[PDB]
């Protein structure tokens, strides 16, 4: 999974 | 005190199964600065998860880099705990970093994996943060 913003 | 550089805190998500809109827990203060966490369905299908901060200032002029744990807490044994790391600059235009699809909302609300209880689930996060700029000149 790649993070990122909401 | 507030200006720790760091903390671990934790959130309990009720009525789980249920959730339809994201949802915010209490600020914890690191570096002064309020983080929050922040739970969200996503695509029932995945839950939502994010490290939030300072996103209630109208301040355009801060920013605050952080590493940190996002761990969703598995009651029946800790070891079963699932949690994934962010490093992240924080500010303004990008207040909040996590995982869209942090886990499968069929794995989380699975009453046989230990994760959820009486419809709550336990979000933690452990944020180290760096010295802000723009905040406390």
């Not at chain 2, 805190?9 to 789980?16: D, G």
Request: net charge negative.
């Amino acid at each position: 999974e790649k993070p990122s913003s909401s | 005190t507030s200006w720790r550089s760091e903390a671990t805190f934790q959130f309990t998500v009720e009525r789980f199964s249920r959730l339809s809109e994201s949802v915010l827990s209490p600020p914890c203060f690191v570096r002064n600065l309020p983080w929050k966490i922040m739970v969200m369905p996503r695509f029932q299908k995945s839950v939502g998860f994010f490290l939030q901060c300072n996103a209630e200032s109208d301040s355009t002029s801060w920013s605050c880099h952080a590493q940190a744990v996002l761990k969703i807490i598995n009651y029946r044994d800790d070891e079963k705990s699932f949690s994934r790391r962010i490093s992240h600059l924080f500010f303004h235009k990008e207040n909040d970093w996590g995982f869209s699809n942090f886990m499968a909302w069929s794995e989380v609300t699975d009453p046989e994996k230990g994760f959820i209880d009486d419809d709550k689930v336990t979000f933690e996060v452990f944020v180290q943060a760096d010295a802000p700029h723009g905040v406390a000149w």
